[PDB]
Amino acid sequence: TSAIDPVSFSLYAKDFTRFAQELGASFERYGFAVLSDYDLDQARIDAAVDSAKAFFALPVETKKQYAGVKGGARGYIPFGVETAKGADHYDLKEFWHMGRDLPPGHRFRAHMADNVWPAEIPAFKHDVSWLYNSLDGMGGKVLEAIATYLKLERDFFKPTVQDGNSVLRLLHYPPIPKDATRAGAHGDINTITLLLGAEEGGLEVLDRDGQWLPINPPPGCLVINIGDMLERLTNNVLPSTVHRVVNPPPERRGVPRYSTPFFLHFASDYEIKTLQNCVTAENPDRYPESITADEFLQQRLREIK
Template identity: 85%
Template structure:
């Protein structure tokens, strides 16, 4: 088997064979909870610029980085090493990260649940480059959801209003070199809270998903791919037709423990007041409704953030 368990789907199909694109992505999501997208149409130079800015920030002294910590329970700015802990885990994850969210105009109804962004003054291009990256992945996520809608036999634009001004977050992740005596792993086994996650930077090994047969499968795609997975909110909406699969980032082998790992997951969220109510087309005699009571996206988010010690 190759170093990645999932065959990529080419984004070129989005324009030339959308039905085939939707079928290939949807089938991968239904089987694994994950899909890999190749041949994306994002500007690689601009992606590289945003990641370079992130690396420059993480290289700053800890006391400077911590000036940007503690904003809205970690929803914005810097989250120091040793804070986030996977649900049920004993040891914290071996990572630090930065969060950027959506900019909202004054008086917007979601401002109570979505804080303003902060920007590191030490990296002048950070705001410009990272904001572009956020918006590019936000747009790409909308296109992936079009395919998911068609796969679920919904109108292609079904998800468009559900994610308008959604509480989506771009996470710039740094996994430092791992000391010999480290406890824990880079990211403990977990499911994502949100609707879908778009991840860049998975070429550096370690990402694995827990398959339905109990086997851990590697996801190490070639460069130039986006790894996408279903989050808990979409699993709930689809009554588990599309599963939110448990995944982790394992520590590297000894010969690579000195190499840091950088990745950039974009957690695409529904709008805060969107009512997550089981889709009728995902309910059947063989798959009865697991969630007869609905919940708003923000209620669901806050419940889960408390579980992983970020709220």
């Protein structure tokens, strides 16, 4: 079962007022929403996924040409080990990260590193860049709904996410002939995160009462969650919630898993200052000192580490 009912993207054009209410209410309750009937070209989503699969199928030494770049913030991250007690013996996953391609001379280049690209997969730059920009665009439309839900101007978020420090992650879990007991519990630090392909993927959100709720959408949906930047902007009216991915069942073991989440971030220089309509007698301002998105990013990374 899924704990969160999908809201059709068809409502974005047909009845935007209802779209914003239903999506917003879901974010406010759970920190998550499920969006069905997206208009993204599925063949081009599938092409990006195929390029990811092709990249991860390359020899290890070929992949490692793209490792050690900016601490893994761009390019490839190989299989590694969790040294902590209680960690599974094997937690094998490999990553590719794509950040924003900035124009020459852009003011953010001093702190946002250039992308690297795998020459061995000729279509990768094109196919994967399309997916980055497609998910960034859909994120903008979701943010319109969030803005309206919050009784803001519909285009409120537009300048706030322009040239945002967003990351498309390509993630692969190879099949291992062994049971775990997948993604340890965490929250996201960014604005919103958009996840394709979560059907029968084991995603769960921690509810307020400490129960884990399955988020198991039908195919052709996006699962979207609030991150800490947006939680902070809204004086915690919209919560950034803890989620995990459980191991597949015995039957689904043996299948490789790929995921391509898009972590949408505010512009680095955007000052996060508490929305005054989220500051009330019962919910006083938790953030009297404002902070830029990049300052907040750096702080959360320091605290995570």
